[PDB]
Amino acid sequence: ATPSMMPQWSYMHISGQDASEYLSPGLVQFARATETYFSLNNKFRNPTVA
């Protein structure tokens, strides 16, 4: 079935939106502002579906 049928898989980031979506946009801009000298590009996993 479509994954959004069950909410848990959406809650644990198993299926649903990506990294850039659920975050409050201020923090996304913050991360994109300091990619070099203080990373944050691995603190959240964004799923994929076939």
């Binding site: 070099t36 000298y37 203080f38 990373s39």
Partner: protein, 50 residues
């Protein structure tokens, strides 16, 4: 016990060199990528002996 890497070097100097040549160290340590580590770099020419 300020020695590290099983050599006679204090931690602080190791951290300073790693930062100044790779911006690496505030988030652990690992092996920097090849193209960012040329011949005259720090890491390629560091040998501890005992």
């Amino acid at each position: 016990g300020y020695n590290v890497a099983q050599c006679n070097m204090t931690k602080d100097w190791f951290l300073v060199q790693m930062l100044a040549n790779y911006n690496i160290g505030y988030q652990g340590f690992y092996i920097p990528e090849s193209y960012k580590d040329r011949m005259y770099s720090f890491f390629r020419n560091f040998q501890p002996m005992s």
